[PDB]
């Protein structure tokens, strides 16, 4: 196999008779679906990074042929300067103090991890809808 064979472009006016979606490559009726063998842990880490903080690195192979950015909402990534969820962060801010009873001696007073937190007109419309 040679690079010049597969990298050779296609002659033509690109056939703009079709729509954008039907001219686009596929194997499955919705996009070219193909297997993969990513590391489990870094998949889960950057997944949880996006799921919490709304940014992650982008997965690709041949989008621009160079892709090294972040995605989602961009500016909050550099607000935290690219930290993760498994890191003891630079500050301990907006924490929320629970009250603990971990003796197992008092009864109806022991709340271990089950501790409920220290924090603890529409019905006219609801009756007229029902």
């Amino acid at each position: 196999p040679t690079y010049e064979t597969m990298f050779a472009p296609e002659f033509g006016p690109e056939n703009p008779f079709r729509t954008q979606q039907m001219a686009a490559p596929r194997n499955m009726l919705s996009g070219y679906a193909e297997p993969a063998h990513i590391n489990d842990f870094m998949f889960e880490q950057q997944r949880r990074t996006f799921a919490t903080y709304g940014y992650a690195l982008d997965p690709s192979l041949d989008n621009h042929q160079v892709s090294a950015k972040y995605i989602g909402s961009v500016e909050e990534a550099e607000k935290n300067q690219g930290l993760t969820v498994f890191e003891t962060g630079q500050k301990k801010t907006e924490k929320r103090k629970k009250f603990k009873e971990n003796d197992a001696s008092n009864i109806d007073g022991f709340l271990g991890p089950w501790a409920k937190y220290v924090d603890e007109e529409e019905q006219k419309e609801l009756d007229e809808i029902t």
């Binding site: 590391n39 842990f41 870094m42």
Partner: peptide
């Protein structure tokens, strides 16, 4: 460039302490 020169070491020897840590080579 300034503190990233050791913050990248923090992230790398943070991440690699879970990349291969828990004997990936709990079951029963």
């Amino acid at each position: 460039s300034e503190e990233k020169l050791q913050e990248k070491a923090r992230k790398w020897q943070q991440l690699q302490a879970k990349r291969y840590a828990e004997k990936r080579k709990v079951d029963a």
